[PDB]
Amino acid sequence: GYKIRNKSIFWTRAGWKNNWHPKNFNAPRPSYGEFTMGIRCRNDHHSFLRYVQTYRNMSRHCKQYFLGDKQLEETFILGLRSLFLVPYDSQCLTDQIKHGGERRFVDQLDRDFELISYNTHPYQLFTYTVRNEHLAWKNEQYEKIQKGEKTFEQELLDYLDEQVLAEKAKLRDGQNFSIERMTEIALHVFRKARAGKVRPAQDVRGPDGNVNDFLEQRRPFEHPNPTGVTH
């Protein structure tokens, strides 16, 4: 499609794609004991254990509001690890960061836990909303199954199993029913099904170039005055 044409896009004064130690005039320089009288520094060697305790708190303090949902605790754990594995797998050389990446990430995670302790972190609220929307749909299926009724998801699974038999019952010259064929059969069913639903307009433009919004009503004028409520 389109690729960045500038070959020097990732160049910095410090090197190629360097976002760990940008070049600045006041660069780090060494210190010599025999000549150093006093010093004021905030660096220390406590980040490793603070990285550990921070993980335990963020996990244990967020589980307070999961109500024993084991599947959510396990899903949240996978998401929590993705937040702590950022420095271990990033392109950025987190080991060469300016003034210590270890202290930087730890202090950054602490600001997240502060919000987690109050149950105000956006990832928490995002989790509650996403889960409630999920359980409502699983309960809708349960109520339909207890009534002996068939779910919309099973009607497709059953409608797709038969469509495969019809295709392989005529596919006798060959006998390699690829995953590609299996896929485009389902998509042909999904498009037909989705179009059947009364969904809000998602694409800007319909079959014509014109937009599918309620505002795309141009001339000619054929609508009369609006009518009132009926008694």
């Binding site: 360097n18 940008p22 000549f35 010093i39 960061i97 950054q108 600001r111």
Partner: protein, 58 residues
Amino acid sequence: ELEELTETHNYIPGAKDDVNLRGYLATQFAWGKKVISFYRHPADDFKCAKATKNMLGR
């Protein structure tokens, strides 16, 4: 994620993005071409200071 950057006051654009491509496009012709360091917070200050036998910490 945008709320997370705001509530943690990580309002330096592209600090938590491993490849701040938007940051390279804006600095293509900048003086002192540089991008923000990874996970840089606008409040952290790692400045130090020392006193030596010479003046100005030298």
